[PDB]
Amino acid sequence: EKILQLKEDIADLVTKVMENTAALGRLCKMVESKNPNTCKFSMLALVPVFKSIIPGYRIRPLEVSKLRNFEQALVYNYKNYVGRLQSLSKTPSNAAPIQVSLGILATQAAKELISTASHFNFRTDIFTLLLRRICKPRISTDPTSIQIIQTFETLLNEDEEGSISFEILRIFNKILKTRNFNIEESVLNMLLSLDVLHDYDKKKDRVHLSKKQRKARKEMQQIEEEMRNAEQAVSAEERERNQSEILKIVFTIYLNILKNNAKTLIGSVLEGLTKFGNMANFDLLGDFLEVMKELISDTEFDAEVRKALLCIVSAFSLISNTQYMKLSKFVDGLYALLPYICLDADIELSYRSLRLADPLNNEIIKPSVNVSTKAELLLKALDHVFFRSKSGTKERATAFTKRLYMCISHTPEKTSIAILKFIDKLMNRYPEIAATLWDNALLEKHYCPVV
């Protein structure tokens, strides 16, 4: 029971530092090699120490109160701290279970740090130590992965000016350029979380001060007024710079996946290209749509059914997202596809294959390109034709009905319910037009007493 004595020694060191510079250096001397219990019981104990004691002003840019020996203490010891974390989580799957458990607890320590740290200039090391853990072809043995994805998502949801996001996605780009885009789709969901890109918008109780102290207070208020206005101007320029370079990073990540053509990733690629579209150069809107037309035409040489449905739904969602300012091959895309859609057995599939987490606010966040199976892709394509993005076309109303009735013969039950519910809405729009023969008695009592 040597562990108990070590626990109380480390506990005494915690009560020293929390309430002093040699003690923290001693705590970093604890974790070197060969002694796993000291390598794990103190490493997770230094986390609340750093959570309480880290000054968020970018420390290390080189009187009675020194504040220089204390800061060389914090920084120099933090180097070997994170450097130790580097050596810990670099261990591959073919290792000792002690070392592997040290790796899991090390990334747990790191992801706990990031929520409070990442302010000062020893952040990129921790960002590599978590993104290299996420960007792996096989995730089924790491319980931390889901939580690290969550922490990165929160990081990209508080980041207003874009400094954090740019410093993440530079490292992230390096990893995605060395490995030929073997990503797990949840990582493109954390790409969706970026709030940098989108906009979506007394007299009695006074402590008495001296005349020199009041004049000092007036001057300090005027300095702080300048700091408010200057930082407003700086961050307003920084937001523009970060949008300009992050969109370059984000799009090239996307289009290189659209080179490799991974069967699962395309849904999340077009999640991004429709959300973070309409904030590009506005010359690229015609270029994005011509890419969508190209990705339709690739499927016209013969899984691919999913891809072409994605292209249609994405295009209409793009133009329906153009909120500020004031489509043949896509409607004809549907009018050609409808045989191929109904001729496949894979219409209903939950789609929870390689994605671990359902990202953020899935009740509020409506994933307007990859909502569910493929049944809601037919529903949302048709909704994005006859209810969004005009294309009125009474002729196409009659044509789409006559193709849906040659699709009822090739449908599972739930899909045919939904299709007939849309035909109810087409009777609402265009007045012309357990069982098996349910409710067709209703609609065929809207041909004969109408026509």
Binding site: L247, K248, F251, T252, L255, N256, L258, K259, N281, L284, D287, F288, E290, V291, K293, E294, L295
Partner: protein
């Protein structure tokens, strides 16, 4: 030179499947039909010696 069209604008041949003619008269065909993905990639992250 091997393309043999001078200080004329390349506004011409934008509607042709070839860029000019060369010595001993044969059709200098346009080399590739690139993807829309690659063209959009080269207008975000521009090539090295662009």
């Amino acid at each position: 030179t091997q393309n043999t069209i001078g200080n004329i604008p390349l506004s011409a041949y934008d509607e042709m499947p070839h860029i000019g003619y060369d010595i001993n008269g044969k059709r200098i065909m346009r080399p590739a039909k690139g993807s829309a993905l690659d063209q959009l990639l080269d207008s975000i992250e521009l090539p090295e010696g662009w």
